[PDB]
Amino acid sequence: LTHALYHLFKDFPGFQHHRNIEDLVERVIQRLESMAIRVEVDDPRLYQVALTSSNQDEKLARLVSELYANNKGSYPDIELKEGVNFEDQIEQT
Amino acid sequence: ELMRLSTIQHKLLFKDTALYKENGSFHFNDDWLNTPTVMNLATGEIGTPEGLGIYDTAYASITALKGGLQTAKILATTKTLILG
Amino acid sequence: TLLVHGKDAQGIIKQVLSEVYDAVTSTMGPNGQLVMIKNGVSTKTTKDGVTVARSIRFADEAHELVNRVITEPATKTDEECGDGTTTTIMLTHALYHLFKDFPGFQHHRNIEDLVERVIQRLESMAIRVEVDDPRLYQVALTSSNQDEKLARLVSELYANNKGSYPDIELKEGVNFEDQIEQTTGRTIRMFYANPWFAKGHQGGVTELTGFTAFVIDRRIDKEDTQKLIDGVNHLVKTHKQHLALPILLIARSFEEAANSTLMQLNAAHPTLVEDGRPWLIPLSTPGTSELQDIAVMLNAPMLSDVADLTKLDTHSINGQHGQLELGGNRSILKSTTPKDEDRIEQHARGIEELLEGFSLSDKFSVRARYNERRIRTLRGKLITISVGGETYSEVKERVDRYEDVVKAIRSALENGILPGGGVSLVKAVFGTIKEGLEDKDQSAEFAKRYINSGIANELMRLSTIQHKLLFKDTALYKENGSFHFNDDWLNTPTVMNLATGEIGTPEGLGIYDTAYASITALKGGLQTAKILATTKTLILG
Amino acid sequence: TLLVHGKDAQGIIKQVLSEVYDAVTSTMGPNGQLVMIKNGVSTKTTKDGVTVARSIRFADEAHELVNRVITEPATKTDEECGDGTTTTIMLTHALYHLFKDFPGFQHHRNIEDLVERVIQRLESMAIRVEVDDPRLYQVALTSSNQDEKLARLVSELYANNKGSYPDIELKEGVNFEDQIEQTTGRTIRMFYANPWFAKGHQGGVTELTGFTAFVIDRRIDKEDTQKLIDGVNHLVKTHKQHLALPILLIARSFEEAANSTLMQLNAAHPTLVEDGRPWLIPLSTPVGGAIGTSELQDIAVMLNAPMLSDVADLTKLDTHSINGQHGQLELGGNRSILKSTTPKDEDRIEQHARGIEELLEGFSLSDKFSVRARYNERRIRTLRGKLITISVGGETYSEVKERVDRYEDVVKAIRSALENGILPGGGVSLVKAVFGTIKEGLEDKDQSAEFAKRYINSGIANELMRLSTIQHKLLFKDTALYKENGSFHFNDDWLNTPTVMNLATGEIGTPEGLGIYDTAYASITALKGGLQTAKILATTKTLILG
Amino acid sequence: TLLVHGKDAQGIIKQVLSEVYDAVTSTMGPNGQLVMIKNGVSTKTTKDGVTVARSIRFADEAHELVNRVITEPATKTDEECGDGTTTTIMLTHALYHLFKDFPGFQHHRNIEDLVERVIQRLESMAIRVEVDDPRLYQVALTSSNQDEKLARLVSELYANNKGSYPDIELKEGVNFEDQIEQTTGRTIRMFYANPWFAKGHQGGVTELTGFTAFVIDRRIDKEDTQKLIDGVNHLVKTHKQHLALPILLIARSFEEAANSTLMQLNAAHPTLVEDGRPWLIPLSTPVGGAIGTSELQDIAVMLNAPMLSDVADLTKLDTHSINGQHGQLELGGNRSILKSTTPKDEDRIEQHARGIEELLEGFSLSDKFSVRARYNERRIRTLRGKLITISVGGETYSEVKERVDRYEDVVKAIRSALENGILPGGGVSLVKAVFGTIKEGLEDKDQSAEFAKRYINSGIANELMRLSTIQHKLLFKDTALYKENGSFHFNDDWLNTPTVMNLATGEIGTPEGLGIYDTAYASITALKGGLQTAKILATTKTLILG
């Protein structure tokens, strides 16, 4: 965006144009801040983000999403350790 | 000119694919704002980001525009470099 | 020799087009700079767009090869109209950047199509000015470099002669004041084949009060020498009773082999010689239908072959008793009887009826304009102005300034008038965008091709270029960084008279351009831009 | 001078071929670029493959030496057909890389034999179009650079004259509109043996209104000098009463020994000379062979001349054999032109034309596509052909002469279309030929054992399939065929129903459906000539500059 | 420093890959050239692919930057297996040219999937050789550079010990002849957690004649520090009577937080210290996963140690659970070695070994070739393996150490032959795998539609066939296979009965007939690693030197 907006300033030179650019871009920023979806803990959209980030893992995206969803009221801090078994083991405290 | 700049990211992501296939370059309209068009690179399908599942973090995209604006303005308005 | 291919050829093209642009554009406006051209051991200092363009040279063969494509089509080929050379180079540069900005064959077929629709609007927007209309003075004032005396005189010459279009010639006079010579006579394109056939046998001005003309079509050489001997002796022997001397043999071209034969044929019959005057004169013309006009004026029959002179009769042969003035440069008719003027006017109406039944696009073509040139020859008066001044150099410069005024006013009445100051192109672009977008039938297609692409918006920015160069560094571009057009400005445009120093409408102030010049600039600018954009290879061998 | 041997010669050859390839191929396609050629103190800007190829020069002698081998055979020698120069240079480049990839004399003899079988498939695949068939319009439209007016007019001229094949000449007109002049006149392949026998004694265009022709078969040299003296003086003395001057001695060839004898024979009888015109004219015809014998028989029938085997047969003649015509003939250094033909003569010509037609009616279907049938059709067309002179017009001088050239391209295209044939355009006919030849050899179980070892297992067959694609690629890259993936690939199904793109309209379909065609002779000769030049370049190891 | 972007980056990568290819490939074949390497003030002259690869250097930083990506993955990281470095560079160069020839992300995702299916065929094709099978001699003969004496001796050592897999060490001898020392002793995968716990407190080789081992499963860190203090002090106080020092705490991993605690616990009881030897030693094993759990069970059975899940289980113990051995053990930083095993202990080990064997007896034929069965076999071999020390001799000093290396190559080859597998050598197995995969996909009528579109019609399938030939070409060029024509070409029949040449003898036959074999693990890993490095090089566009 730096590269993009740098060309916009060189394309409309002079101080009078600059104050117009800066004001319009500022109003765009106020739209993105309004368009933003502040997602809640219970909301099932987290699964879609989890499914994308885990390289299409059906098992992992379900478990981590449930860990957040079940604890409705407290934001869980997660630590990871190299286990021993084939299966995973969870220790909630 | 500002409308042309917003396209830059969508261009770099989905150039050399089946969105820019019918003509020389893909162009947005009034209808595409209600139901956007992308491409899932893993699967190979065309749809809406809401449908397919492509999302970004809001704070990252917002701060990119704010920080991009300030650094752009400085570079545009600099006329002197002191190396001493 | 070397062969240039790829990014390098497109690199050369861009550089040459840039340098030509800068040199030619700086000439325009109130801060119009001056160009200093070397010729031999002298110095010519001017601000004439054409003269600058004609004289730009480059050292490199590659650079010069390109230079002959951007200047020379509007420089060497453009001999009939000098004006609109600055404008063509200007639009070429503009439209070149438009083609580079939207690459690929699919965009190009869209650009070429929209620009073609803009051309159709300008051809419609043209105001067909009348002879009596006072607007001609405003056009005369602008073209004469703000001359109050000259613009008044030339405007009056056309205004006073309401009904006939005056042909104006210029000669270098002797006095300080100007002298006008008005004559009610027609000018013909025929002239002597050889100086021997004139009065005094040395290319003089032969005046006649009777003749019998014959118009041949073919170019005459050594092959037609026998056909002339058979032809001439047939009329002199058989049809001498109904024959007024001299016999005028009008044709396309007379070669020296044929001219020498016709000299001896004059000597063959010495009885018909009156006061030195030869009774047979060959006459050449520099376009088949121009000889048809020549035939109608002098009651002459049209003949395809030279051998057709034998098979003739009293019905075909018609000897006139008017008044003609033959010349080495041109021939001049004077005395035309009411019987002859009926034949000329009827023939003129026949050409006019052909122009009435053509399309609007073909009215601005070479076909229609040549047919109008036919009419004006068939119905025109001759005026000879002898231009004067204080020195020798001041006279010949004033001669050129008169010639620019004549060329401007002729083309003003002929072709049309459009609002000057880079306004007619802005109105045409903004008009065509709005028309296509507002028309709900094709609005779906129009938006996809031009509007959503950004072609429509980029084309609006181009039309502004001329208005910018004319009125930058002035009180229009004072309020903000740059002046921007709106919806309201199309109805009532805004310019500045540089002579006075006032703001108003081109209609109010009086700034106009010739329509044919501005239209040809856009047509020729589009073609040359497209070629330059699409060239990838230069061959120097 | 210098002598280049080894890896450097092959180094230069590769570079020059590369540069010429790039310049000439960039001309092709919808994104067809433009070449800006310098000539004197002017600039010619064009996209014509032949004009680009003719004008490429190099500074180094070694580079220029090679340049005359790749361009000049399809440039300087190719005078009859202008089209198929971009095709030849393209195929040369492709096949050169095929010879380099499979080196050694054993592979080379296998490449040459497979390409030879592809050539045999193209000649089989050729569609012989008829005069009435509307496909000619599509050929006319493509060759005219998408002209709606010109393609309609020229296609009508051939279609309206159903029975006679029109010969079209072009002249620079005067008006804005075009003007057509139709004349019932024939073109003959006879021409002057020596310039002396013409009007003005310097190879001029002699016009005649009466003659007495005699057709000899033999090639005439120093051995027949005595037979001519006995022959000519027999007719001039005995049979002068029933003889219209001049006497035309039509033959195969007149050598300079015989021509000098007949010059003196004209001087022997000065009484029969009228206005400079020699009363005896020898006339040669470029034919050769016993196929070529029957063209003189056509010449004999047109002018009511007797067919004579020997020169000594001129002595034994009579009023029944000798027939002096009183029509109109125009002799020329390039060709002779007949004009005035009486109704009595046209009965003899049409009867002789029917005799050739009846021979074609009683042959097999396979032999109708042969050289024998097509030559016999060329005989008919000469015997029933009309002269048309079109005077092309326009707005300026330059627009006229450019339109003249655009007319000439359309005439050349339609002539060769009816003459030779039609193939599906868009680089499709070569793909169908290769993919056909490989499938035929592999499927044929008799020679499948040998065919697999030579072509299939080697990878020659597979590499040859990739080369046929080259033309189709250059035309339809950067368009909606190459959109779904990185590159378009042909399959088994596409051979039955091919896929192209009409660049004017913007639609996808079959060449048969849309209407894109090429002349068969151009595409066939390009493959033949491209193969030969490729072989030479690949096999050159030495350059001598002295 | 400089930044390289665009066509220059791909320009450098192409050049460095070319030079490394030329330098390493020239080593292979009967006309196998020799490389002369400078080291200090001496000269090493060799035809060893790995040693050539490790030693190639460049002057420019950009060049050396690229050079570390092509060599170093199969050079510095590959410490366990030296063989298959020439092969990996070879395939990298081949597969790089494939990725350049079919550019674009859609083609690339297809190439990667096809090569993946070739890999699956090679893993299926592998012949699992048995100990008694005479084929091992052919493998030994090829790996020893045609040594008749050595290949006989090493093959006999494995063949005579039918039941136990011998571990072989090598030492520089004194005599001209070799001397063999056979010992009934086991090698264990346990080693020191910290160097402090060894003899001399600096990671020495501690020899013992009595111990009491305890096997823990968990990975030990700062969390288990309290559990160790409670555990160790419980046994030292309560169960001291039936305890032979030292106490060995075998586990998965000991972190530095736990090691420092156990150092202080040794200092807590100074009465139990004998001649410097610490009475408590933590011992780690590199396993991981639930497959890896059962290796500690083998460790437990060998030393009569109880299996413990938690560290806190050390408290709840008794005379029935605690068992102190009085054998002989040799602890080490690399590995531990058992020696003295009483007849009572060998009964327990053999009974446990039979339990693993019985599990393998009751599985399907397909699962016998899996990772599960082969790991369970690796368990048995550790539980029943004997130590052999060969002292290699010769005429000089240099001839001995060279013969030591030649022995080590033969041992590595025979170990991996029995372990992983055997494939037909001479670049035959790759050609069989590719031609197999294409034929299987094309012949299978279900997916034939998709398979033809992606691979066959594209020309990927055919281009991949040409690559597999590369190894066979380098080996048997300039010989009587490539004699009849310019180049040898494979067919359908040659897949059933392949054709090579024995370079020692000079005869033509099948690899099965003549006796040319390769280790399966080396050939598979070369294809896997060659594909990954090839992809990276083809898709790199930028070099940062700062």
DSSP secondary structure of E291-337 = TTTHHHHHHHHHTTPPEESSGGGGTS--TTT---B-S-EE--SS-EE
Buried b (16+ CB within 10 A) or exposed e, E123-135: eebbebbeeeeeb
Residue D125 CB-half CA count within 13 A: 25
Residue E322, φ and ψ in degrees, nearest 5: -80, 125
Are the beta carbons of A2 and B76 separated by less than 8 Å? no
Q: Contact E385/E165 with Cβ under 8 angstroms? A: yes
Show residues of chain B in contact with D506, CB under 8 Å: none
- Give the experimental resolution in Å: 3.5
CA atoms of D244 and D266, how far apart (whole Å): 15
Q: Which residues pair with E280 in a beta bridge?
A: E247
Residue of E nearest to A85 (CA): E290
What DSSP letter does each residue of C301-352 carry, written as one string?
A: PEESSGGGGTS--TTT---B-S-EE--SS-EEE----HHHHHHHHHHHHHHH
Chain B residues whose C-beta is within 8 A of a chain A C-beta are 1-2, 5, 8, 42, 53-55, 58, 61-62, 64-66, 68-69, 71-73, 75-77
Taking one residue from D and the other from E, the number of pairs with CB-CB distance under 8 angstroms is: 39
C-alpha span between C423 and C494 (Å, rounded): 9
CA distance D485 to chain B (A): 8
Element (H, E) at C496: strand C495-497
Chain C residues within 8 A of D400 when measuring between CB atoms: none
- The two three-digit tokens of residue C295, written as one number: 């035939």
Q: Which residues in chain E have Cβ-Cβ distances shorter than 8 Å to D453?
A: 489, 491
Nearest alpha-carbon partner for D306 in D215, D211, D235, D240: D215
With 0-12 / 13-18 / 19 or more C-beta atoms within 10 angstroms meaning exposed / middle / buried, residue E51 is: middle
CATH class of the domain comprising E188-362 = alpha beta
D42 to C68: CB separation less than 8 angstroms, yes or no: yes
Angle at which helices C86-101 and C105-125 pack, to 10 degrees? Answer: 150
DSSP code of residue E245: S
CB-based contact E453 D103, cutoff 8 Å: no
- Using CA atoms, how far apart are residues D274 and E197, in angstroms rounded to an integer? 136
Tokens (6 digits) for E16: 């460095």
The enclosing H or E element of D508 equals strand D507-509
Report CA-CA distances (Å) from D153 to D83, D144, D392: 22, 12, 12
One DSSP character per residue, C245-271 reads: SPEEEE-SEE-HHHHHHHHHHHHH-GG
Closest among D152, D185, D137, D126 to D371, alpha carbons compared: D126
Q: Chain D residues with CB inside 8 Å of E486's CB?
A: 102-104, 106-107
Is there contact between C and D if contact means ≥3 C-beta pairs under 8 Å? yes
CB atoms within 10 A of CB C97: 14
Q: Do the chains contact at B27 and C104, CB–CB below 8 Å? A: no
The single residue listed with the structure tokens 């497979």 is: D114
Instruction: Find the length of chain D.
Output: 546
What tokens were used for E12? 């450098």
B31 a known binding residue?
no
Q: How far apart are CA B54 and CA B38, in angstroms?
A: 9
DSSP string, E455-492: IITTTHHHHHHHHHTHHHHHHSSSSTTS-SSSS----S
B40 annotated to bind ligand: yes
Place of tokens 């592809």: D118
Apex CA C232: angle with CA C227 and CA C234, to 5°? 95
- What residues of A are in contact with residue E297 (Cβ under 8 Å)? none
Given CATH 3.50.7.10, say whether it is the number of domain C188-346: yes
Give the C-alpha separation, E81 to E35, whole Å.
22
Contacts of C366 in chain D (CB under 8 A): 176, 395-396
DSSP D198: S
The answer to whether chain E touches chain C by having 3 or more C-beta pairs less than 8 angstroms apart is no
Question: In sequence order, what are the beta bridge partners of E211?
Answer: E325
Q: Which residue of D has its CA nearest to B20?
A: D483
- Strands (DSSP E) contained in D417-471 are 422-424
Cβ-contact D33, C5 below 8 angstroms: no
* Side-by-side strand order, sheet with C179-183: C165-172, C380-387, C179-183
Q: What is the 3-state secondary structure (H, E, C) of C133-189?
A: CCCHHHHHHHHCCCCHHHHHHHHHHHHHCCCCEEEEEEEECCCCCCEEEEECCEEEC
Nearest-angstrom CA–CA distance, D156 and D136: 10
Instruction: Please tell me the distance from the alpha carbon of residue E153 to that of residue E179, in angstroms, as a whole number.
Output: 11
Q: Do B18 and D483 touch (CB under 8 A)?
A: yes
Q: List helix spans (H) across E211-293.
A: 225-237, 256-268
Q: How was this structure determined?
A: cryo-EM
Number of CB pairs, chain A paired with chain E, less than 8 A apart? 12
- At C60, the amino acid letter reads D
DSSP one-letter code for B19 = T
By the 8 A CB rule, do D141 and D153 touch?
no
List C-alpha distances in Å: C478 to C29, C504, C506, D201, E421: 17, 16, 20, 84, 88
Q: Which residues of C touch B27 (CB under 8 A)?
A: 448, 452-453
Give the count of alpha carbons within 13 A of C136, CB side only: 29
The answer to whether E522 and E419 are in contact (CB under 8 A) is: no
Contact between D462 and E459 using a beta-carbon 8 Å cutoff: yes
DSSP B32-82: HHHS--EEETTTTEEE-HHHHT----HHHHHHHHHHHHHHHHHHHT-----
Angle among Cα D85, D91, D95 to the nearest 5 degrees reads 150
DSSP annotation of D306 reads P
How many beta-carbon pairs below 8 A join chains A and C? 6
Number of alpha carbons in the 13 Å side-chain half-sphere of residue D540: 22
Compute the distance between CA of residue D483 and CA of residue D496 in angstroms, rounded to an integer.
22
For residue D424, the SS3 value is strand
Rounded to the nearest 5 percent, the helix, strand and coil shares of chain C are: 50, 15, 35
Provide the phi-psi class of D63: left if phi over 0, else alpha when psi is between -120 and 50, else beta.
Answer: alpha
Q: Looking at the structure, give the CATH architecture of the domain made up of residues D188-360.
A: 3-Layer(bba) Sandwich (3.50)
